[PDB]
Amino acid sequence: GKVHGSLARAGKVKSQTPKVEKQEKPKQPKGRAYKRLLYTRRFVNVTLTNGKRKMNPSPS
Amino acid sequence: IEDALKVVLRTSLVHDGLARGLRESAKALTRGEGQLAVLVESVTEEAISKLVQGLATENVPLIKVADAKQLGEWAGLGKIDRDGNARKVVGASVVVVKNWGADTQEREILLEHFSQQ
Amino acid sequence: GKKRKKKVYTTPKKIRHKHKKVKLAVLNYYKVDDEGKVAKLRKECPNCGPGIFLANHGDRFYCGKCHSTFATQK
Amino acid sequence: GGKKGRRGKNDSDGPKRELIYKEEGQEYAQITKMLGNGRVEASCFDGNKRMAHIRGKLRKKVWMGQGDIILVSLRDFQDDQCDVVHKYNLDEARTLKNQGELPENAKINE
Ligand SMILES: [Mg+2]
Ligand SMILES: [Zn+2]
């Protein structure tokens, strides 16, 4: 109907959200390695020179 | 011979000559239609083969090829999209040739030999 | 706007008429006379030609090919 | 009336809607008095007088007055106050009156 259940039930959305498990996620290098990875990814592996850098370019 | 049988099954699959089954085969033999018949002896309870023989007495010649499943396989019942067999099981257990279609010399010599017996 | 509800039916069900399959059906139509001559248990239909067997249900015989035009009392 | 109407959603549900019942805490009530600040007083059909907020999707979307049957959702942490969730336009209210989810001593008819 208008409201499926009792309204304002102190955490309704969190209760009924589908619990989706984390991905296996191979280890991300950390420390100086992370900075080296960022430097390589941005200033020696320029990907999308058109427009801006557009880091995290949404696929569409 | 193995070649003439596949040749005749091709010439009857092209022009719709195979009575694929036994009821259609029985109807063709009762009529003046069934010009050839191949059937397998590895049939349980053996009465279907006996009925085929009796209808053959009555369109006379018959062949006694075994391997019912293989008989259906090289009888053209399969869609055979791939090069290898793409269906689990398919069989005929009786095939009747009605339309002779195209004619090859080796096949006519073979059928004359089988008629001579 | 349209306000449609879930349809409720005042009828239990009508079921698809499944075709009556018969194993070893063809041999019942015939009869082997001891390794040789054979006879037919069912009757032949004249209009279609030789081979087609008449249907006997009760005090009449009925065809399948020209089924509509042939139903002759026994 | 007015030029306001063309700015609206034009949500025309004139045909007879299917009335909504009460579900585990949502209960029927009757508007007793009209207060300010978009809040109403609802006598629920349990002998209690709850204070019901005129609620979202209902504030300036339907206009409700004194002596209107109503559906209201309670709050388990605070029982005194509640929220008006749906309004019945005096036709299905008769149906509930015959079915008697509410005590019939509350007779409100035109
Ligand atoms: Mg408009
Ligand atoms: Zn007929």
From Swiss-Prot, chain C:
Zinc finger intervals, C4-type: 45-66
Coiled coil (UniProt feature): none
Function in brief: Component of the 40S subunit of the ribosome.
Subunit structure: Part of the 40S ribosomal subunit.
Protein name from the UniProt record: Small ribosomal subunit protein eS31
The organism of origin for this protein: Kluyveromyces lactis (strain ATCC 8585 / CBS 2359 / DSM 70799 / NBRC 1267 / NRRL Y-1140 / WM37) (Yeast)
Gene: ubi3
Positions spanned in the full protein: 77 to 150 of 150
Curated annotation (Swiss-Prot), chain D:
Protein biosynthesis is among the record's keywords: yes
A biological process term (GO) from this entry: formation of translation initiation ternary complex
Compositionally biased region (Basic and acidic residues): 8-19
Domain S1-like: 15-89
GO terms of molecular function: double-stranded RNA binding; protein kinase binding; ribosomal small subunit binding; translation initiation factor activity; translation initiation factor binding
Any one Gene Ontology cellular component term annotated for this protein: cytoplasm
Region feature (Disordered): 1-19
Keywords: Initiation factor, Protein biosynthesis
Note: Present with 35100 molecules/cell in log phase SD medium.
Function: Seems to be required for maximal rate of protein biosynthesis. Enhances ribosome dissociation into subunits and stabilizes the binding of the initiator Met-tRNA(I) to 40 S ribosomal subunits.
Record-stated family: Belongs to the eIF-1A family.
Name recorded for this polypeptide: Eukaryotic translation initiation factor 1A
Species per Swiss-Prot/TrEMBL record: Saccharomyces cerevisiae (strain ATCC 204508 / S288c) (Baker's yeast)
Full-protein interval shown: 8 to 117 of 153
